[PDB]
Design a protein around this ligand. Sequence first.
Ligand code: CDL
Ligand code: PC1
Lengths: 108, 365, 37, 49, 231, 206, 90, 124, 54
Amino acid sequence: LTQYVEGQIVNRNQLTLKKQEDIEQYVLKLVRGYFRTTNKQGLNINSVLQDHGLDEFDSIELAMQVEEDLGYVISAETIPVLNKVKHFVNYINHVEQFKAENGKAPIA
Amino acid sequence: SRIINHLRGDPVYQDNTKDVSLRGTFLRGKYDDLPTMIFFTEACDLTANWIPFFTNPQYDILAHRNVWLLNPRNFGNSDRHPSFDLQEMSDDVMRFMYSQKISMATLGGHGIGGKIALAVGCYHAERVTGVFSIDSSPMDQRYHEAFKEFKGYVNALTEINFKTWSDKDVKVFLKENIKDPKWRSIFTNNISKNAKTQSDSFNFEINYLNHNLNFNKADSLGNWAVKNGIYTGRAHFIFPEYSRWVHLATNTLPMHKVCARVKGFGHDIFYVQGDENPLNHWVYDFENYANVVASKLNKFLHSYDGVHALLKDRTEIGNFMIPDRIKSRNDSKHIYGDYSPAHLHHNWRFNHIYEKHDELDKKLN
Amino acid sequence: KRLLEKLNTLEVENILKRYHINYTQALIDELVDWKTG
Amino acid sequence: THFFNRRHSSSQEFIRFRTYTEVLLKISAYNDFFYVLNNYYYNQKLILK
Amino acid sequence: GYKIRNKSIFWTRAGWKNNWHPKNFNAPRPSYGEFTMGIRCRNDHHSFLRYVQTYRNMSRHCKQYFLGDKQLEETFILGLRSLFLVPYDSQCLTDQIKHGGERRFVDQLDRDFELISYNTHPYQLFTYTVRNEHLAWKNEQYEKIQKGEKTFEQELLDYLDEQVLAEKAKLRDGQNFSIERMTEIALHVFRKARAGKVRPAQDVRGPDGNVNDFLEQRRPFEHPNPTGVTH
Amino acid sequence: QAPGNQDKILKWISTLSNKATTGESRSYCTQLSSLVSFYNKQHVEQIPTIDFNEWKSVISTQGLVDKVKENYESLIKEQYNTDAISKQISSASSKALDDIENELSFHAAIWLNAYADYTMFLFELEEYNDPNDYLMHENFDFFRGLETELEELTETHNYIPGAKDDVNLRGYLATQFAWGKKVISFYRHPADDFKCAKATKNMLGR
Amino acid sequence: VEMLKQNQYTPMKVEEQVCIIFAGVKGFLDALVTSEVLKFEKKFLEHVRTNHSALLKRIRDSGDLSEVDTNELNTIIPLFIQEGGFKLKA
Amino acid sequence: LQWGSLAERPMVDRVMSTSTWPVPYYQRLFKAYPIREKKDKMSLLLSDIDIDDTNWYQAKDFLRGSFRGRQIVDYVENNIASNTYILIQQDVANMAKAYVHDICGYIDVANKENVRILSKGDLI
Amino acid sequence: KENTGSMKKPMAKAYEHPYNSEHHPLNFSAVKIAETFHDFIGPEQVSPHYESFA
Ligand SMILES: CCCCCCCCCCCCCCCCCC(=O)OC[C@H](COP(=O)([O-])OCC(O)COP(=O)([O-])OC[C@@H](COC(=O)CCCCCCCCCCCCCCCCC)OC(=O)CCCCCCCCCCCCCCCCC)OC(=O)CCCCCCCCCCCCCCCCC
Ligand SMILES: CCCCCCCCCCCCCCCCCC(=O)OC[C@H](COP(=O)([O-])OCC[N+](C)(C)C)OC(=O)CCCCCCCCCCCCCCCCC
């Protein structure tokens, strides 16, 4: 659960949102944290990542970061459909609903 | 004004070949202390035509060296003497270098000028750092078509008599007798009217020149004699791909035959990519030819000119050690070993930089 | 055009040609006027 | 073949794209003179005009 | 300087500059169901997702040895994208490759990842060496700054700012201090500073200002020519 | 004041307009030009002098000519305070100007970094001379990074020359006179084999 | 012809006519459509009186069109046509 | 520290040598490279590469080293509606808008002053 | 304001591979074989003489 940060070992912390308002804020904070994102303040819930300097390969780096912060195991079949902020919010909800009903994580 | 400074004088006919003084244009460099470059223009050709090449910011040649655009004897403003012996014409430069307090200089030439530059290195090698020849070779050109036209035109120019002929009679004579546009323009601008408009005449000695060419013997300017010897120093040759003066097939061998340090094609001998055009001899007119000559010229002056023979480039100065021959030094208690050869200041004789730095070295200790 | 083709068959000028710079007739006039003026 | 193509294959009518090594060298292998030149251009034009 | 003269240099039996489908005798031909009994083929429609997971792996497995260096993670990403964007930006028509360029590139990236999983890929070892040399130079500046000392980089910037003032204080006729002029001033200083490293500045003469250094020298007694004879 | 004070202002607007390509940009350039001409319009009408004594003498209403003079002179004293305006415009300019003041700066920093790249290359290139007279491993050290690329080809067994080069010019120079003139396909590996095979009602898969 | 036309009870100043008549012979009016030449006259004169007031004074006092005025006038006439909203398609 | 004369070049460019007879016959084939060290020199591969992402990424790195540069970076990456950090100017539309919106704002300044000066007293 | 700037402390070091060295490079190339080759045949044997030995 530990990772290196600027040469120092730091304990990694996982988040549990379980709320719509907390998800929209996390995704924006996530997308605004990526060094490739343009117009970080112009980014909203209905923002197309293509309109902010992000391509298919950048959505992977974002999904890879969602696994780090939340502990999910996102399959390669789901990544290439995450092209909008709205998509990350709905996918995160679908995962929380799946574990709350099926008692297990979705197929990876 | 300042960058362009050409000493002014009147040609003097001389009976003794040693009392010959050379005159030409001097182009000052950007920086304070720089080695000097002596450049010889084509025969009967103006020095001014080479000014835009050496004074172009894009090339920036003056950033490397100070340039002396010098006229050989019987050409331009320099003194006049019937002999064209390269040994005599080479001593003229050595006296000029002495009168101007130049210990050693970089030599360059265009066409026949290239021959004049190389002769100085052949007769005075200890005082020449390098040679850069443009569309020339140390070769007999008496039977080259390009030389025959020049040899033919000069003979036609002897028919005109300025005293009787009028200005219009001259212009008609040149167009019909001179077909080449460039040679025609060069000769027109070489005509000058002496003070008091007494009469017009050529800046170059038409009589002495025609005899050298018309006779067409060893002393001819087209000829390169075995008497001239070998050049021991750095030499770089640049000529057009299709050139009437230097044919790539066989006219490159004289370079190896006359210049001991010439490595070969691609290192010291280059050809400029170009089409067949009789005007390619005048590289300074066409940007494509000039841009390559300048880059190659700046490379020769920066890395190859004035560098010891056994060293590859100027980068090896101070880090490559040359082997020594046994029993070559007077000291008997000397352990023979490798050494880095001494490279001196370009004008160490007429300055006291060594005496000055010796004092500064003592202050450290 | 026909009569023109039939008829077909200054220090400032030379100095500018050395620098292979295209010069118009108007420019030549001003430079000459600049010297005389 | 690798040495010649990477030094003589580029042309002006096409775009030469940077490789991985060319990215690391430009960003993580620049010398002191390069660092000075960039800051020299920025201060004179972007700051001091 | 020198241009290729042969006009037919880029000609191939498949067309001009065709490096996607070279002409061969056994050319691809169609297949008909009604007449086809069985077939053995390895082509599939899994290359897209394999192109996605391969990126995620090569990125995540390389970050194990970056030590949380954020500036290096972002730099590595830019380099990783340049490797995956080759098929999308190349002159080669990757969509017309002989037997499927998608499968070809994916199988090629998989060979790079295998070496990456072992930390034996030349890009990794090259990134570590390049980065360590960079931090050693950055730490040298830090140690000199904590001592209040001036860095060699700041001394140049200060020496260049004052030279600009000296050169523009005399440039009154014109007032366009072009970027060209700013450059040649800096390069002239660089050439003198570059030569100063090998020959430092002892006195007011400055960097590499001693003629005696270029007189005849000899190898020291304690370090003779080890590779060859001297005489 | 009147002459020559607007010559420089005309060059700036001319260059600004010449750079405009889209019609929308041309429109804003016209708007900008009008504002400049509006602010730069010269007023010359030979403000006449008033001789109240002359009018006072010839004819006037008692107290009028004097009242106009004292009141006229009072307003003549009032004048614009150029100092106050000069300071406000210099301290803070505007909002929209700050948007492009920071945009064009980063824009220039992008292209100054590229200008420095090309410049420093030509600076380092001065030490490189006669590529044909350097040893193999010394040349690769000038072009640092080629050895790393050459290792990747070897470790992946991409030992077909020019397979990962989009323009394998070296391959074209070697095949100028080859039978079946062809170059290797892009990213071709010596181990990949896409051969297929089928069985039909006819023999030989036909 | 479209330039010489004039309404009733609308006299023009001598200096103003010189400017308009100048733009016509020089051929600048060939750019805009003919139907827009008449209105261009009004807009051009008004634009001159406001911004270019010293120019009108010289032409009036001296009564001659100096070379300096020609260059300035020759430069604004093509410029103004591009500034105002007209039918540039000839 | 010592810098010498700006005009003078390094002594290497000024220091020269000349040849004489006899001459060594040997023609050097290659440059000596006994020790494999080429430190402090940048790669010549970085020669003719077009503008790319490394240009704006390295610009921020150098801009973040200055106080004024840090403001430009934060504002550009947050308050500029652009689909890429590779800024290319091919029109002056965005530049003219910001000028007309600023130089126009300072209109009515003189007419405002006239109100005060003229509203002061009535000529009559 | 610019003169008041400071510099952050950078990282001490990046990853050091325990099985790659300059003399024993992990991966193979013809560049390292060239270094070992020219060390075997030695550098160019430059003659200081004016005539060849033969
Ligand atoms: C008990 C008592 C017994 C012992 C007593 C002691 C006696 C011991 C003997 C030792 C003698 C002194 C040794 C001195 C050095 C070696 C000899 C020598 O000439 O070196 C200088 C000679 C050149 O002199 P240089 O002036 O210093 O070089 C200047 C230039 O760099 C050169 O290149 P350039 O082109 O720039 O300049 C011109 C160049 C132009 O000429 C050349 O360059 C020659 C071209 C040759 C290269 C062509 C490609 C062939 C080589 C491919 C490599 C194959 C071998 C390796 C592969 C297998 C791995 C083992 O050189 C010349 O001017 C003419 C060449 C010299 C005259 C002809 C000599 C021919 C024989 C030499 C080779 C030996 C052949 C094998 C014979 C042995 C039989 C077992 O060097 C060589 O060319 C190669 C030397 C290799 C010799 C090995 C054999 C040593 C034994 C010597 C005994 C005499 C020869 C007996 C054979 C008789 C057959 C007719
Ligand atoms: C000494 C070191 C060892 C050397 C090893 C061998 C070196 C081989 C050098 C490479 C050349 C190899 C020849 C391949 C044929 C190239 C020409 C060609 O493609 O034909 C096009 C030819 C020529 O087309 P063209 O247009 O390019 O040239 C025409 C020539 N002129 C101009 C003169 C008319 O056209 C054809 O389509 C003919 C097709 C039949 C080709 C016959 C190929 C038979 C060989 C293939 C089997 C080999 C596999 C062996 C595997 C062994 C496994 C154990």
